[PDB]
Amino acid sequence: LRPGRIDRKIEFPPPSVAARAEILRIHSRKMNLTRGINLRKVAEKMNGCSGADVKGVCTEAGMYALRERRIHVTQEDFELAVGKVMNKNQETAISVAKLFK
Amino acid sequence: MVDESDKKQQTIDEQSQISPEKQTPNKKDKKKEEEEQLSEEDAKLKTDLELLVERLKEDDSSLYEASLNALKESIKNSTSSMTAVPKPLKFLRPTYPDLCSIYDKWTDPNLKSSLADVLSILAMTYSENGKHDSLRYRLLSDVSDFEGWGHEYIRHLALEIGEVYNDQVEKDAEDETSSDGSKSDGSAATSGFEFSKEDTLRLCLDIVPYFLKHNGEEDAVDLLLEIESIDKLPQFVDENTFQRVCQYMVACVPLLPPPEDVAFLKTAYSIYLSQNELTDAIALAVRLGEEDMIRSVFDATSDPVMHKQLAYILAAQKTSFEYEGVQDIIGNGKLSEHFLYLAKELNLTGPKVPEDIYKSHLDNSKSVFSSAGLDSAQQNLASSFVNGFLNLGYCNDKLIVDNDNWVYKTKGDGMTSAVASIGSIYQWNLDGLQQLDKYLYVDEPEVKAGALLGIGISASGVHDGEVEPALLLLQDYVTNPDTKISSAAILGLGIAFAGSKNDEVLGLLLPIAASTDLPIETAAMASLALAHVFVGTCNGDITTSIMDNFLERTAIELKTDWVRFLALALGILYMGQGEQVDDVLETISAIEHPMTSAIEVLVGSCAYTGTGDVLLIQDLLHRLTPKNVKGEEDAEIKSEEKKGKSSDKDATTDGKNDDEEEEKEAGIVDELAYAVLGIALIALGEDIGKEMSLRHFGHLMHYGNEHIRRMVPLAMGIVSVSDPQMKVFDTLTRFSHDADLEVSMNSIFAMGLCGAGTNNARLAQLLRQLASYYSREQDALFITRLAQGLLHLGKGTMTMDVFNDAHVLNKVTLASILTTAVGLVSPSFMLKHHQLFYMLNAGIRPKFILALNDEGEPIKVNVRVGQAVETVGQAGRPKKITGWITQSTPVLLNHGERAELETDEY
Amino acid sequence: NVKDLKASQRVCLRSDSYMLHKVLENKADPLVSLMMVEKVPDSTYDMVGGLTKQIKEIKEVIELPVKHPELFESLGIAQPKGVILYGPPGTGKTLLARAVAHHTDCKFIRVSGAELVQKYIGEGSRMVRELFVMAREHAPSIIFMDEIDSIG
Amino acid sequence: RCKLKLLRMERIKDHLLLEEEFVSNSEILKPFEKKQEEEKKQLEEIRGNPLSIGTLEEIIDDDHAIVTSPTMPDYYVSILSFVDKELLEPGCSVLLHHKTMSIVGVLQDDADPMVSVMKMDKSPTESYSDIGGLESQIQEIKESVELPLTHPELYEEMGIKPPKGVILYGAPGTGKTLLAKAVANQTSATFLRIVGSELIQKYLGDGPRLCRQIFKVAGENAPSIVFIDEIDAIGTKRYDSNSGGEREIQRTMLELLNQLDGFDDRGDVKVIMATNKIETLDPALIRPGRIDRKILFENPDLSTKKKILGIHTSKMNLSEDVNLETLVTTKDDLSGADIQAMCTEAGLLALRERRMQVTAEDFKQAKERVMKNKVEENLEGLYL
Amino acid sequence: AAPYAAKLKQTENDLKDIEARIKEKAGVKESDTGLAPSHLWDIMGDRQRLGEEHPLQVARCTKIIKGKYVINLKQIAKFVVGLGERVSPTDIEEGMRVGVDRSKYNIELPLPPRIDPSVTMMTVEEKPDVTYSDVGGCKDQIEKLREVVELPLLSPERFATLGIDPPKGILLYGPPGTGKTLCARAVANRTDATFIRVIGSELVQKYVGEGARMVRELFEMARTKKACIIFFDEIDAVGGARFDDGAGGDNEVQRTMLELITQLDGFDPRGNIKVMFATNRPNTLDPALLRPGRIDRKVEFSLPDLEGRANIFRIHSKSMSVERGIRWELISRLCPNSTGAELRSVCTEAGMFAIRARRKVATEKDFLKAVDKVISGYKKFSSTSRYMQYN
Ligand SMILES: Nc1ncnc2c1ncn2[C@@H]1O[C@H](COP(=O)(O)OP(=O)(O)OP(=O)(O)O)[C@@H](O)[C@H]1O
Ligand SMILES: Nc1ncnc2c1ncn2[C@@H]1O[C@H](COP(=O)(O)OP(=O)(O)OP(=O)(O)O)[C@@H](O)[C@H]1O
Ligand SMILES: Nc1ncnc2c1ncn2[C@@H]1O[C@H](COP(=O)(O)OP(=O)(O)O)[C@@H](O)[C@H]1O
Ligand SMILES: [Mg+2]
Ligand SMILES: [Mg+2]
């Protein structure tokens, strides 16, 4: 942190909601989607603070779709994945409380 | 960026970033309707300029290029350049950046070729108006910097550089050159050069010399004078203006071979004469070698003043710097003429005042004695010469000398050279005469002869002004019929006067060096002396010396050694110039036999001096011829062969040394590597050739004044013990001497081991002993530089007797030459109005940084040291005057120079 | 012969007494050892995209002075040194450094604070000079020393 | 500018040097001389074909040795002894003959993965007085480090021991780290540089062994300069506590005492230490009488930063809007690395607009960002 | 930009390209040693060549069987071997190396014991020749060394007349900077006894048990040598304190500590090994070398006295070029009680003031400046009266 060796500082913030929708899309470009799925709608269900959370929602949607054994990933699997991954946020380490001093 | 529509000043620039709506459509349609709209187009010209001005900020090529691409079309398509020929001509001002933007900011073969030609013709014709000049100028000092113009502005000025260079190469010149169209001189392109030069002198120093060298006239330089002479102090300082003037000449040393170079150096002198320092005028006047310019400067200081003041002392000090003493003769005689103050000025110019200041330096320094007295056989001769080599210069070791025991046990040639070593103890000093008198009046004719040698050496620090010169004593001894007596007299005569000339000296050295009918091997010294007299000034290239060389070769080869010395004497004589040595190379080569080829190869070294890079390949081509001849056969002579080979080895080295001082000085470091490889080549190539080249290497270093004096002599020295000829160590130590007991400690330590450790002949032992004792003096009493000091690119005259001795195998005969080592350097000291024997302060710095000079200038940072120090050689050369804090002003500048200080205080 | 031979070049031998025959048509770079055992494929900006700002920020100081160091000479700037990437884990901090490197043609050397990537020197202290020297052999390069500071 | 003249002259003599060398080697490095032809006949008679490598454990004084090969088997070798029996010694790599193993010869010059770390992989491209400013106590580092190498003459007049060692200390931003590399440029003595976080290892006992090496290498070059960067990094740094800890730190300090002087009496090594924590060291190295003059450096004051800033802005394209003296004026006794950082950030703002001219605005706005790093690296803001 | 500037960039890059070219064409080669007094080497090279006379697979005796021996080759493989015709019944000892023949295993040539020595040979060097006329400390302290170390090496005749077991050991302990190493270098010239100098911190290895081997090998080898001194330097590491941990990592180092107790005391006493131990803290010593039975009279090297500093500064200034008429007593007064090494740096800083002053001598004045420099130095630091706490 000595002054003059640091001339660029790249902070990556927690995603915006335009950014967080596109992370869902990035993973889905290998996947099959039933037409009409908006991963912007799912992004408004998310609040997030890392793009790791949304990578787990896509992984879960294709493993629910694997359980079904359908080629398409169906739209209820992306509903179930957000609530399943949020339970997983409360089980890797708690972080969303609102309960403060 | 994007087109959005104009409703403010910011968005007009945005509109025209994609597509001008004001310079492209409007102007084009207008031009192809009516020739009454030419009145409007002139008004719109200013409008077109401003939009260019705004948009010289867009980093990438594409949206400046493409946008102006049809404006480039409008030149030939609508403007035509022939619809009145004033009107299209004056409308070429906005279209000219546009042409460069497709030419250069896009490299494309079809259009870059075509548009080079277009830029030339229209530039020259539109600089008649003088609006083409101003058009460059708004881009010269630009608006903002980005990629594009970093290439663009070089194109504008490249048209000018292009044409003048091409006019010299081609035998067609003018507008017949097809990559231009600009006329060679005229007056339509003459004005373009004049306007361009004013600005580029102010901000740069880059195209300023380039243009002059392309003109090749001191006229061009004299136009530069007018602008600079106003600029001398207020715009940029005197010192800065000086650095410009010497940068041109140093930079254009290879670029102007000799006949061209001197014509330019005449103008550099004139600039210096006009401005404040007449000290820099003198330096450039020596550099030419011109007697006349020296006299002009002497008159400039002397005539307006009739009072002792700093001024008389100053002329005399300036001429003193040349320890060749070409200047010393000139300055002695105007001073007698003026007849205001005789007493102080005549001595000061002469080397007589330099003897007095030496006494003060010697007090601090003390005197080192370690001299060998261990005699018995050949070791007697070794020890007696060693006595002198440890006390070179002015020192005192009187009690050891007056013990005549060891003096008299020497024999033959040893007796003569034993008394000569005694005289070099009292070198550069008038006192000590009493010792020479003893020997002169006692035993065999030999010691009388050696007393004379001492006079010559001692006289090197007192002659000029014609108060007890070497000529006065020694003219008598030449007349004497005995041979030893004559040879000793004329060798010492040559030493004392070095670069000085006088009729009695010259005319004495004239009947002999013309009579080779008599078989004397010690009449080499006759030419040797004559050669020095000429060095330092524009050559006489005396026809007598060429005559006798030819007559001796015809007459005898029974003594190849005599003629071998004579061949070198010509090559030392021919120095002082490079213009004139061209002609005599042609005279000697008229006569063509393999013996004459030997003479030629030495004189080729001197002939091409100061620009040679042709000399060097040629001096490798000579080497191949032995092997070539062998190939052919596969598919009295002794003397002739021997001379062929020895001359070649000395010449190859001599070319490298001579070239490297004169061209620049940063190349000096590179030429050292050739010699190392040359030794390896010469050992498998010829057995005899090796003997010569070992010795030449040590003197390669000393002549060129390398910057690395620590590493290379010690590294050479271990290996060279096995190799034959121990005369090598002696020649390494002439370089190594630098500041004494700096470098010289390692030499003593290393050389005493190899000497004690190995005895393999008492002959071999004698050389090895002599060398160590040379290197040391006494806490750096004096320094040796082959260079003049005033110029370190220049070449002196006193050290050319040192350079002589490596071409012939070692002897007791050679030892007599080798005892003399004149070439001493003065301890730079402040002078005032009463004559001061010490300094006050100096700054010292290991090296310069500047690009401007290759002689360098010390930075104003330095490390501080006190008064009374001898100037220090390479590996630390820069010396600064520190007196600014004591509110003093140097009068005689020093930057590592030899020049002695004089200071002005109010 | 000795002028077709240089150091770190693999050869083939016909053992007539170890008689050098040809150069071998294979070599495994020692820098590639580290990179292998790590194992990284190439990325671009569709593995980062959707935070369009980041690509610009790093482009100025990382990409350009590999591409053209003449810009930074004209500017006069003393060239960039360390550049800190920080943020939540899962923002593709590593993925941006991968993305620059395929375009710039750098060797993307991901270090991780490991003693497992090596098997030829086997400590990180002595692999600071040497890592630089390998990245200079195979220049251009990006040394992605990912510190973690979980170690100990 | 107009440094052309230099580049031409140097380049031209190099061209000729390349020419001369090539031609010298071929057909006039005669393998037809009898001193080359007769020498190789009887040299190869005992010199191989394959020359099995050994490592020399010990010699015996009867013209023998006992080698241990890296391949395996030991051998009780003789010595052909035209490589001069007393010229070789343990640790050397030796040439053995493939019929019966005799020492044909000895290879000299090695390299290790442990001197790879030391050796230079660059030659500094910033030379002296790019540390310019704070130049009033650069006289005790150019008259004990540079000078005895440059003149042994002045230290002959006084005689006794020359100056050895300097320690540089002050606040950071006084240029110490490059100063070390810049006095090395001038002397032309072998400059080793070793970082002090590589004299801390995560293994035990092998630390002193690495440090012991460093000075034996240096004395082998007759002149060297060794720079230890941050010799306060061997008295604050540790890895794990079971192969590091207090002990690892403790030992390496003690080792470096013997290396700096002790019994060894090695060659000339000039030492340069930069430190700013000078109380984590043995009280056996920071005494005068080892490291002779100790140099203090203080933050550059108003007039000194005028010296510093002309160093950095000569590389910049200055506008006539640019005022250098008001950039100096505001700051009060602050670091010279800060000035270097503000000029770098000024060219970054200039690049942000896209223009390779540097304008006044870029320096004057970059100043405040630099000052925000002093006034919120302490979140107290204005002192409370 | 400017028209000539455009060309500077090209010529610079031509330089870069030609340096590499010159280097490549010169070639890289491997230096090989020579000897000019050998122009014939195949007068004795041919005898060593081409038949079997033999270079020997080195082995080592592991057990004497009385009438053959069991050796371990260094290829590890074990063999019973006999006796050839260069070897007798009495030449072979336990743990001794022997060279054996590779076609048939038989003792060819007996050899010195143990090939493990190579880092016990990097603590052996030949003696530093520093005089006893310039030493460190001008007290009675070095004559105490001259009775324990020096005199029984010179003359065991006096200690047979006393009848006492000759005196061997001594501790050099106390303040830093007092020239303890200067006096063992001074003694190295004078006695003409081989010196073996040890770093105690080179005795520790990552793999514990390695430095145990190390110590044993050096010490027994030294009993075979005659009339040597072993200078145990920097043994505050190993030779320090001992204590037990519960999860530490100090214990591996203590192994070498224990081996120092047991080689010194032996199962016989030292076979003409005089031992000096230099401890720079009198506070780090094993409590089983603290007992004085093996470390006989132990002499504290302390900081100079006010008369001792005057003497020390006079050796330095007789060796320096000065003007006499300078008081060396005054200089001791200005100083506090402090190291002997400060006075050794007064002269060299007075020598740097010589050069600024433009002198060949150092005179009275500038020693005062130098004295002040070092004193303010000790003010800035410590160990100006510290013993590392507790005499
Ligand atoms: N006083 C100064 N004057 C000029 N440049 C300085 C100064 N101090 C530091 N620098 C510059 O800062 C950069 C790095 O400084 P360097 O590493 O040499 O210094 P340091 O004092 O050892 O400590 P630090 O790196 O923490 O500043 C270099 O570009 C150097 O030129
Ligand atoms: N008493 C003294 N007289 C002269 N010089 C001394 C004296 N003491 C120390 N010195 C100088 O200090 C240098 C280093 O001291 P040395 O290596 O002998 O340390 P030491 O006294 O054994 O102390 P420590 O155990 O604390 O390191 C010596 O080479 C010597 O020049
Ligand atoms: N910005 C992003 N765009 C697309 N996918 C992402 C992004 N960031 C993270 N991922 C996904 O999340 C995974 C884990 O991210 P990781 O590489 O651990 O992030 P970081 O480098 O920030 O610690 C990746 O392997 C990838 O599948
Ligand atoms: Mg992660
Ligand atoms: Mg620092």
Ligand SMILES: [Mg+2]
């Ligand atoms: Mg200690």
